[PDB]
């Protein structure tokens, strides 16, 4: 096997880390203290789960995780929480003063005085690896630490670890759960500087997760805890092939090969069905056909957009539960003739299916019901550029007036970096249109 280091930057990154590592623990049967009874090789191993967990002599299973935040209060809840014994204190790095929703403060000002420490703590985990694959980076587009410090990390990770792959789990800003007004700036700035350093990135629009939590879980006003537990299900689905026995998406390089032919266009859409409420008394369990068919409904996507007005370069159906190949092929046969699934000319019109017989694990006292079978479709569709267009339009309105810009410039950043970053995004929108129209 080959090891994977997960990095959680900023509030959003950290709290999404918590949810994932909680879920990974329940999936592999690892307990809060870190013992795993079903693991028989005590002290080490090269099993599939060892890609994400290291081992000690006492029998503890320790996440290959680094938590980074420019203020302590969120990572303090990890130090005092249910999974406090799980982590070594050196993995949990905190500063004193945050980035105040300012890219420039996170990247340049406060970024500089902590970047060398963080890479050192990352190097302490890489040296425990017999053969490092690379990194899973969790952060928000909207925050100053999430946007700013993440892009500085990704720049350095390319220098220190040039042979390794880097995957992103990005939270794209939604006004309905954000109190920051300057997120459009932060999101474009970090997307510009992270683009050449990120091999494959999974965007999650907080708008889509929020409305899924309203519509499908019957939750009136979804909290971050409601959103994060749902996100971490999608994340787990995506990373299950790295952690379990299988032949699809077995390493980080294969995510790029299967999903990303055109390197700049490395933003695959995630769709996920079924999301069903635990409070629901009567639920008729959904079939392979029904949940595969749900992967092409916009209301289940991680980013709201219309795949019909766009083209695919790659599709991947990752199933969890009672599913067999012929049910999947029969579902795909039905769906091809009903729905509008147009591929690009140079790509084969096809699906890479991955099935794991273990059904999705649900967090005790959570919002999600137990299900017989579920699926996460990962499709590289040009329709996701809809999200860039929205972000770029918001950017253009504010930036035309130079609104808020002085805060960025006052932290050492040059005004030219704004229009420089917007021009990359202007090209990115153009790249998507060439491919998809």
């Amino acid at each position: 096997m080959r090891e994977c280091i997960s990095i959680h930057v900023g509030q959003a990154g950290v709290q999404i880390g918590n949810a994932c590592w909680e879920l990974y623990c329940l999936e592999h049967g690892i307990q809060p203290d870190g013992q795993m009874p079903s693991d028989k090789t005590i002290g080490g191993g090269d099993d599939s789960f060892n890609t994400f967990f290291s081992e000690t002599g006492a029998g503890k299973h320790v996440p290959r995780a680094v938590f980074v935040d420019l203020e302590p209060t969120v990572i303090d809840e990890v130090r005092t929480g249910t999974y406090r014994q799980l982590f070594h204190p050196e993995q949990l790095i905190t500063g004193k003063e945050d980035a105040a929703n300012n890219y420039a403060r996170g990247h340049y000002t406060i970024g500089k005085e902590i970047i060398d420490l963080v890479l050192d703590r990352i190097r302490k985990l890489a040296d425990q690896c017999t053969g490092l694959q690379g990194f899973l980076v969790f952060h928000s587009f909207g925050g100053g630490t999430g946007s700013g410090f993440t892009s500085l990390l990704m720049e350095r990770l390319s220098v220190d670890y040039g042979k390794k792959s880097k995957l992103e789990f990005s939270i794209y800003p939604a006004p309905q759960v954000s109190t920051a007004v300057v997120e459009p700036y932060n999101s474009i700035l970090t997307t510009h500087t992270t683009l050449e350093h990120s091999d494959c990135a999974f965007m999650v629009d907080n708008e889509a997760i929020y409305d899924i939590c309203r519509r499908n879980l019957d939750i009136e006003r979804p909290t971050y805890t409601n959103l994060n537990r749902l996100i971490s299900q999608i994340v787990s689905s995506i990373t299950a092939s790295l952690r379990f026995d299988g032949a699809l998406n077995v390493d980080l390089t294969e995510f790029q090969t299967n999903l990303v032919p055109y390197p700049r266009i490395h933003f695959p859409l995630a769709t996920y069905a079924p999301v069903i409420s635990a409070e629901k008394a009567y639920h008729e369990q959904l079939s392979v056909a029904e949940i595969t068919n749900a992967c092409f409904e916009p209301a289940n996507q991680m980013v709201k957009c219309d795949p019909r007005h766009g083209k695919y370069m790659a599709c991947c159906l990752l199933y969890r539960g009672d599913v067999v190949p012929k049910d999947v092929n029969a579902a795909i046969a039905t769906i091809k003739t009903k729905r509008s699934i147009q591929f690009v000319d140079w790509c084969p019109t096809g699906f890479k299916v991955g099935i794991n017989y273990q059904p999705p694990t649900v967090v005790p006292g959570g919002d999600l019901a137990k299900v017989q079978r579920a699926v996460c479709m990962l499709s590289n569709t040009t329709a996701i550029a809809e999200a860039w267009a929205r972000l770029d339009h918001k950017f253009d309105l504010m930036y035309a007036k130079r609104a808020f810009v002085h805060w960025y410039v006052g932290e050492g950043m040059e005004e030219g970096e704004f229009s420089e970053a917007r021009e990359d995004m202007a090209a990115l929108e153009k790249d998507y249109e060439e491919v998809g129209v």
Binding site: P175, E207, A299, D306, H309, K338, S340, H393
Partner: protein
């Protein structure tokens, strides 16, 4: 108090819809680039469909169906009909057309060329139905409203855009007898006002001259073509379950031949109404398309047919 924005100043149809909405006291117009609207009366080219349905606490509606251009451009319409199973190459109501990039009479179009020597190249209807007295060609325009639910509403009033010149088989270069467009004519208004024969008169002519009705001889075929065309594209363009909603007014252009067979010529995405009918159609657009989605404090005929087989 709902809100709308107007992003098409040329649109003679939605100027009247804008006026009718304002003259109620329950619809305020906003600026062209304000995001906080309920209704977008949008531009023809490059309408930003990606920015719709992302403003929290606002149900958003637009007056264009995205992807409906695949019915309305001539090149795409020909490619749609040949490739879709439910229309097919052997389509009885569409003239034989071919695509080449920039009785054996054809017509070229996208500067219109009608010859045998020589965009799309379409089979020209050599023996059309000719009105009398006049011995002259026409085309029929039918207005079609598809709402947010995909109810296909045909407007009861259509119009025959007539040629005023006698039709000539030998003389092709003379455009005024072959091409029946309103701009190309303006004998402009010899037989009827502005070369526009409405449905009441055209029914009566068919009764007197042919012993049949508009409803039977022609309109049954029009309803079948409209319904077949839109239900074909329903999976591609429908806004059911979608985060924003769409309607659209289409204009269907038809040709009736000597043996009373109806042929589809063109579908139009941004059609204009005839001068008399604006007031009724635009009130119909408000009642059915807008007021169904946004309720305040029948002129159409619904096209539905579920034959079991």
């Amino acid at each position: 108090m709902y809100t709308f924005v107007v992003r098409d100043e040329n649109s003679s149809v939605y100027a009247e819809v804008s006026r009718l909405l304002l003259a109620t006291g329950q619809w305020k117009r906003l600026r062209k680039d304000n995001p906080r609207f309920n209704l977008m009366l949008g531009e023809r080219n490059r309408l930003p469909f990606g920015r719709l349905g992302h403003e929290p606490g606002l149900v958003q509606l637009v007056n264009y169906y995205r992807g409906a251009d695949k019915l309305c451009r001539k090149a795409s319409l020909v490619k749609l009909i040949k490739t879709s199973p439910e229309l097919s190459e052997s389509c009885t109501w569409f003239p034989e057309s071919y695509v080449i990039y920039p009785g054996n009479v054809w017509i070229a179009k996208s500067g219109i060329l009608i010859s045998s020597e020589a965009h799309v190249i379409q089979k020209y209807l050599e023996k059309p139905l000719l009105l009398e007295p006049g011995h002259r060609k026409f085309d029929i325009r039918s207005w079609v409203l598809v709402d947010h639910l995909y109810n296909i509403y045909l407007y009861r009033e259509g119009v025959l855009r007539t040629s005023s010149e006698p039709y000539n088989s030998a003389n092709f270069q003379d455009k005024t007898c072959h091409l029946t467009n309103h701009c190309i004519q303006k004998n402009y208004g010899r037989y009827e006002e502005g070369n526009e024969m409405f449905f009441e008169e055209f029914n009566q002519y068919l009764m007197d001259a042919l012993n049949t009705t508009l409803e039977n001889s022609i309109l049954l075929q029009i309803k079948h073509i409209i319904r077949s065309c839109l239900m074909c594209i329903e999976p591609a363009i429908s806004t059911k379950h979608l985060h924003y909603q769409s309607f659209q007014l289409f204009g269907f252009d038809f040709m009736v031949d000597e043996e009373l067979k109806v042929w589809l010529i063109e579908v139009n995405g941004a059609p204009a109404c005839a001068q008399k009918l604006y007031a009724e159609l635009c009130q119909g657009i408000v009642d059915v398309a807008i007021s169904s989605v946004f309720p305040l404090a029948s002129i159409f005929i619904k096209l539905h047919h579920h034959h079991h087989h």
